[PDB]
Amino acid sequence: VPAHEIVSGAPAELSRNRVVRIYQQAKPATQSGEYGTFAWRLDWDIVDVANRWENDLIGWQSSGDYMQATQMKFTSKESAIKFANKQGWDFYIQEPHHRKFRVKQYANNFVHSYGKLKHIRTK
Amino acid sequence: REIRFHLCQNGSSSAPLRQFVKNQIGAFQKANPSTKVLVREANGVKPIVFARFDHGHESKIGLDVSSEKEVAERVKSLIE
Amino acid sequence: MNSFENLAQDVNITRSGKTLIAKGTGGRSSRTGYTATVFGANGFLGSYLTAKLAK
Amino acid sequence: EEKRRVVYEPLELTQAFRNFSAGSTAWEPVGPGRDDRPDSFKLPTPK
Amino acid sequence: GEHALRRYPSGEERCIACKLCEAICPALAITIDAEERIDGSRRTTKYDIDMTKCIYC
Amino acid sequence: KSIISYNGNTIEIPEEYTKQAPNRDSTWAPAQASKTEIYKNNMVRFEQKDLSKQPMPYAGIELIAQQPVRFVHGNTAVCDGANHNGPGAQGHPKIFINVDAPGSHACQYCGTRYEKE
Amino acid sequence: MSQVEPGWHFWLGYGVDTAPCNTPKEKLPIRAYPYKFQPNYTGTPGAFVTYNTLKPKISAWEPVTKQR
Amino acid sequence: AEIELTIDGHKVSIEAGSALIQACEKAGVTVPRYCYHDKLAIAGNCRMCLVDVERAPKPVASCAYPVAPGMVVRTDTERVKQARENVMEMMLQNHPLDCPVCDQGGECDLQDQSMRYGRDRGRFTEITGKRSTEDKNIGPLVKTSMNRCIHCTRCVRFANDIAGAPELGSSGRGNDMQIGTYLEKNLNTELSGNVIDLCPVGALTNKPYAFRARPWELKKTESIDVMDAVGSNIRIDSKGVEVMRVIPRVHEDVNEEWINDKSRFACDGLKTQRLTTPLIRVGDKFVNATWDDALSTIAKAYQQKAPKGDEFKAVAGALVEVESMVALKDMTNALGSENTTTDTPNGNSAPAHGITFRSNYLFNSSIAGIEDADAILLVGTNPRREAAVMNARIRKAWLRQELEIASVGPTLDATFDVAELGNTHADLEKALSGEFGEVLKNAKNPLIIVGSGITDREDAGAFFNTIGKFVESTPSVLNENWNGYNVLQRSASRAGAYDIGFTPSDEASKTTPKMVWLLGADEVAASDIPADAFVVYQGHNGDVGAQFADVVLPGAAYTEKAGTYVNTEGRSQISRAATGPPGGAREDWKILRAVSEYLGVALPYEDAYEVRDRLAEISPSLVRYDLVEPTVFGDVAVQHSLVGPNGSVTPSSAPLTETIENFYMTDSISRSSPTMAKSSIAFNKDNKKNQA
Amino acid sequence: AIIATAFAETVKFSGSKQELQKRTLALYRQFLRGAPTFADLYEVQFSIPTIRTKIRQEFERHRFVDDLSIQNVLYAKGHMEYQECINAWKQQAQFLKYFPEEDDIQGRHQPSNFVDKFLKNRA
């Protein structure tokens, strides 16, 4: 693995103190769309002193962390890993979580009760 | 003071330690009633025991072994 | 990055009783919490003094 | 003012940058679309 | 030229804190915090424009 | 009006300037920041300055409470909030309020309360 | 240029034909409060001060002790 | 066992009898919808998923049309695009112009599908206009604005099926149909803040997060939920110094998309009564102080008291990090005193079951395994309150299958059907001998849940004796391929504490301490700490436990730190830090690492990776994040937990009590929040909550 | 632009490690020949052997780099830096970027231990 962190122009502080995270974005519980859940995002863990603080004056969110808004998209997981250790970065990788396939029937809703009903559907 | 050791669950280089578990747990507990035992398991782990003496001094051995009397010997060695 | 070199710490209490939590890293856009009045800041000493103070 | 020059320092902002790219669509917005490949330059289906 | 927050007839602040002016602003001059007030009406607690980074689009 | 200046110093402002507006003295949001709060926080820079030419622009929460309540005989009350001297589309989007519960139901854009009678 | 009334300011710059005493009752906007007209106080000590409209975002604890 | 068909030219194989929408999701084909959901029943209300099917005259609803072989499905038919525009325009006619004031601005399903599939313009311009629906006060947690409802039945299907609260419903015909309680009845359930992520439009929405923020502004962060037994997955949305809401990301094992009420609405107490500076007691008054002041006061008081051994108590509490427990255990044992206890009553001794053999104190069947259950019984617990997601699991498996329940303890009001057995250990042993030896011996996949509320009972070892004898004697409950003895643990810290070995010895329970350390540890009483003792409280916000202290030290809460957490199942999971600790709070292991230097202890780590290495030295199943291992030691562990309390503890006739008094205020954050404060009073037994 | 600048070099990439070592040593000679015109040109406080120790230190940063392409990109960046410094294009404020250490003492309270890093939480 060639070490490109000396020829990128990035400081040594970023490659030696900052840990970064590769993750695939979760499907939102809000809406039924799944489009932003395919690319692998690369995202920096926050610094606890440098993350954000409110201003004296008006209360603007001021920051000294500069990688807080940078976020990368990759097609592949191995793309993100190859780029991340090619730039010499400490990374954690988060495995995705898909839904378990369960067979659904509409005729499931009204099957015959032999004993206690134990449920009342509505529709 | 207390002692803890680490296995891998599937039979790669830890079955002699594992039957040393299954027959010598109850013997070791009344051998040392003062002393707690922690046994822990995960698929990738080399069989290792740590023991913690008083004021936070601990040390470890590796259990690259093929005999129950041998791990017996190793934990004999380490509690001293 | 920048750092508070004038401060021994972050959280500084003054003797009057005021609690002062310094914010952020060092440098221009952050605040230590102290309020200072420099008389004669026009002066030859005072220009350097409040240059080092407001830094 | 001490060195009487401009100095270059590590960066710090009075208002942090807020990107609103987080908050894009969750439905894929455009279809695949049609082709304008001519029938001269695509592979023949057999038979 | 400069900015103004208008009011209704019979004096009501008009800003229902929909964050649209903040979402569209090409130079990120708008900053708003919004809270539900005592009436249950939706208003801005905080509205702010930096006129040094405003571009008059 | 004397407020403590984080040190036991009490600083003194006229009481016409501790009101949120000349309509209402108290604050109308749970994070509205009282005028005593603001002046307690940064009076380092209200020094040598006139409090008179500060804006003071007339809180609307009580300018909406003195408007009369409209009465509708039907079931639903229509609202746009437009003027009808202005050539164009002003006011808010047109929303329809149900007036069935006891009391007055307010428009969520303008605040004009409607009641069924 | 800051000392001209707003309705007149649009007229001086050739925006409107009809001067703001010439316009009828229908164009004059309805208000429930008085008008006062501050021109501009730049360099004047009545210059504007900006501040935080809201209180600090995270509360701190009121110290409460207890004798056990 | 499978069926192969064609959607859009794609050829797809799916299990027999499934839905056509599941075939479309398997083939990658995007089909829009409004009243279909994975964890809910199928309804054909919203008419959005119409699809072109060969050998069908009309476009069929893809969510309730079952899969058949030889099937040719088209979604890009001109008829299907026309049908989607038609049904969209039909939906939009009575839906009010509330998009600048609706809370689902960039998160509205209706709105994002109206661009992609709906009509450009609108023809709705009558004088008579849209209908208007009366607002319906449900409760204090759910804001309810029902002009913008589309009648997707989804809330009603959910509170019918899974939440077990049948108070919701649909009352009326035509446009005068409404979705609410008909009487204006208040809705309780243990998960009622989950209906507001479920509604696709903003008709049911968040009340403390009414109009505060806006989804294109929010920064999302994937963390782990403390103040829950199961340790569910969340989604922290942050403006950046403040925290707005948590919202569940999916995991089919730990929470199955559905999350606790108490987990959700405790973001209010995250930011209201926080410790931002260290404080030193002068005597009947605190003062706030310097770090050197507080930590040197701790060092000077250690040199003044001089506890030589077994007198430095260090008790942790409900929510702590595993790494902070590493720091605390290492500091006390390099001090020379394992007076190292847990917070609960009867926490001063070994908790009547083995720290030995992890399967003693864990939920040993998988949380995914309860779905396979046949006939299960619980002792001493209320799974409706503690791990309210496990109640959804039990009611869900009981609804789909033939499941048999009984309970030993207080008479609980389950969502599901329990049988009663008694209020006595004699009632227990009688029920084990009489009916359910036969039932649990007959059953294939039974299990037994043990609450940790009876672990905190002084008569615990009799219960563990009787259940260990039964599980060892019965070969069906305990065999090779699955394990059936199971326990629940109330707090997120108890499983990690029992992993690390955070429990006292028999010698350490005898002495009275001169210096007590509270790391969290909020439910201590006044009588539990001695009056001469120099106690110091390290915690993130002010509490009962903060009031007793001579020094308090602010810590980072679970949002502000990246942390390892272990649940009842045994999963190690990391929380990502969303924001930073405000004012002057720091990270919990770094504070202990710094106090050690003013004592005589140099802890061997000084960085986060060395904390991870020391954690792997404790046990390597805590660097193996979100994996579950089996146990080969299930036979040996039940015997080893049988031998200990055999005859040592006599079963007394004290009745089995309820573990928690209320649901809503049980730890340091939930007691600080005004949301739980005004929630526990409105979710007390009133006429608005009586079913009558 | 057919005529090029005075201290130009056509950028050329070496297939051998040793010919790049030849070019690197020639570059070091060019830098240290030009240290007195850098001291006169940028009106500096100090004397010429501090320019010379900085040139040597900036070369001992990159001594144990193995990969030949990364050493080629490093040599090209270094020759561009020499061409900027010798032609008086960089100004004194960016010439003194190289000396952040020398201009002043930045103050007291340099955090060395864990605790004085902790008392200001790394500031």
Ligand SMILES: NC(=O)C1=CN([C@@H]2O[C@H](COP(=O)(O)OP(=O)(O)OC[C@H]3O[C@@H](n4cnc5c(N)ncnc54)[C@H](OP(=O)(O)O)[C@@H]3O)[C@@H](O)[C@H]2O)C=CC1
């Ligand atoms: N050789 C030296 O330089 C020495 C200086 N000092 C002392 O240090 C202090 C500052 O020295 P330095 O900075 O070098 O010289 P300065 O020029 O600064 O001394 C005058 C400073 O104080 C202000 N000043 C003088 N009189 C008044 C007055 N009646 N009202 C208001 N302001 C006034 C001046 O205002 P303005 O700027 O408008 O002129 C100016 O800021 C002096 O006290 C000096 O005695 C100590 C030993 C030797």
Ligand code: SF4
């Ligand atoms: S927040 Fe901005 S865009 Fe929205 S109504 Fe107010 S002024 Fe208009």
Ligand code: SF4
């Ligand atoms: S739910 Fe309806 S009113 Fe609210 S934003 Fe979405 S489309 Fe607009």
Ligand code: SF4
């Ligand atoms: S209340 Fe919400 S989820 Fe339920 S049917 Fe109405 S819009 Fe749908």
Ligand code: FES
């Ligand atoms: S989701 Fe298939 S019709 Fe409503």
Ligand SMILES: [Zn+2]
């Ligand atoms: Zn209106």
